[PDB]
Amino acid sequence: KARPKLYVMDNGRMRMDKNWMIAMHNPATIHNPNAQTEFVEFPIYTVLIDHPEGKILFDTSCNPNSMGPQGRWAESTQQMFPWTATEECYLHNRLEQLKVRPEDIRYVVASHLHLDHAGCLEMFTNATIIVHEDEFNGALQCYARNQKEGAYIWADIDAWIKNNLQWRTVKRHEDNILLAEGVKVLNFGSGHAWGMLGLHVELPETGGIILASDAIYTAESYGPPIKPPGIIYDSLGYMNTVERIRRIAQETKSQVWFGHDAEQFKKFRKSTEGYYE
Amino acid sequence: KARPKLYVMDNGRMRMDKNWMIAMHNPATIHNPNAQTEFVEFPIYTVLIDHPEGKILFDTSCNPNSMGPQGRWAESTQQMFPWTATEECYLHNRLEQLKVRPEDIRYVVASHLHLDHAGCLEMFTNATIIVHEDEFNGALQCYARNQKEGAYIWADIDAWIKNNLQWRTVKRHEDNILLAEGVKVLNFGSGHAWGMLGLHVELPETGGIILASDAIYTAESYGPPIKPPGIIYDSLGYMNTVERIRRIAQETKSQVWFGHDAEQFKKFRKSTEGYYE
Ligand SMILES: CCCCCC(=O)N[C@H]1CCOC1=O
Ligand SMILES: CCCCCC(=O)N[C@H]1CCOC1=O
Ligand SMILES: [Co+2]
Ligand SMILES: [Co+2]
Ligand SMILES: [Fe+3]
Ligand SMILES: [Fe+3]
């Protein structure tokens, strides 16, 4: 039986309007007609599965050259979704401390292609990049239409193409994919974005874990009841996905790891302290 | 050839958070982390078609007993979506000034069953009430689960049932319905709410008119580009509906009358000044 080790890697912090994360979280009233929102902070992280069959990476955080005047992100983007991270937080450094080079990664699973998950895809030229086909198509249209604003970074996409990444698209109606012993890719479909992927991992000692990414921002999103994000591509799809994750967790007695939950993240054992067997 | 007269009836004004009407209209930034929304005012109105084949009413505004301590609307609702109207603004009074009694109405078309469109359904006991089946089912579930908050008013629904209204549901996949010479019901389906209906009218002198209701809040919603509302049941469905309306307007050279557009409403000839032939 395979005895993998799973690492949680801290890739810094982001802030944005709380309305993005929880829609109409604090609506104006007759007694508060100019209601104020908040500017909340949350973690960006990635997960490495050191599996005997090969190393698997879930998400890739933000590109190190995202912020600043010479940054890849448009000015309006930087102001609405600012990212802060020290050098040791960069993905390539986190991996380095584990004695892992990018070239050692067999599979990268991209939950979706937003700026905070697909930032460092270009690094893994020796891997197969697993992504939802609808998410891929949508991003490429953004590129082709020369969209310089939004959550799809023109400069990042440019780099993927130039670096000749090897893509494996998950089809709209494609089943879950067994990646390795006790590791399965979940096809969540349209919701938060054009197409979302998750991961289910079964560890001998710790048991089952579901990586939900932005299918579920936080425990507050999860509920119940469900509290959806401010902007959504497919509201119906989003609601269905959350409830599907809940069912899976119950039936397999698995933990659910959210995309950007500050409190949950504090509890994790990170790559600087150890791993999950 | 039939020569109808179409009347626009002013049924008062409402206010709410602008984020309801235009999602993320003013997002927080690093420089404005506690961004403020606004509390915007907009008209509630209904349309009467005095047709030789019979009188047709589109929407019914709010119930006269909605607001106040003894009001049908929950406190939280009254504070988030306050309605103001004088006595002459009440639907029953507007009709009276045209020498029209509720019993004279042959057809009522309910665009949807929100508090500001289905308020006075209970009045028209001599009419056939045309509504989307999915919208009807959803409202009845709110009632059955004893939901006392939200945009579906428990007390309003209660009254419909007690007054023994005569329902004709539009099926999910049912075609447009010819109601009378030059009057057609449009099935928009799920979007803003569970199920939306519109109307297309062809007048000898004025030409074509599309009544969109909450399928399109305002000219700003309409664009292009489309700016969706803060909360939506079916985002995908909503976007599709707007574009469908644009196509119809172009192909038939029809004006589009929005649900709650203050500027457009000012330009209408109201029932106090005349009608459209
Ligand atoms: C459609 C999803 C909302 C678009 C804005 C965005 O990309 N926001 C990031 C921030 C953390 O996770 C997110 O989705
Ligand atoms: C579809 C969610 C409803 C948001 C609150 C609401 O019901 N607002 C009114 C005001 C005019 O049209 C509406 O739907
Ligand atoms: Co995202
Ligand atoms: Co409505
Ligand atoms: Fe994210
Ligand atoms: Fe409305």
Numbering used by the authors:
A (entry chain P), B (entry chain D): 7 to 283
What text does the study give?
GcL possesses a bimetallic active site center containing iron and cobalt cations. A water molecule bridges both metal cations, which has previously been hypothesized to be the reaction nucleophile in this family. The structure of GcL bound to C6-HSL (0.8 occupancy) is overall similar to the previously obtained structures of GcL bound to the substrates C4- and 3-oxo-dodecanoyl (3-oxo-C12)-HSL36. The lactone ring of the substrate sits on the bimetallic active site, with the carbonyl oxygen atom of the lactone ring interacting with the cobalt cation (2.6 Å) and the ester oxygen atom interacting with the iron cation (2.2 Å). In combination, these interactions likely increase the electrophilic character of the carbonyl carbon atom. The carbonyl oxygen atom is also hydrogen bonded to the hydroxyl group of Tyr223 (3.0 Å). The N-alkyl chain of C6-HSL is kinked and interacts with residue Ile237.
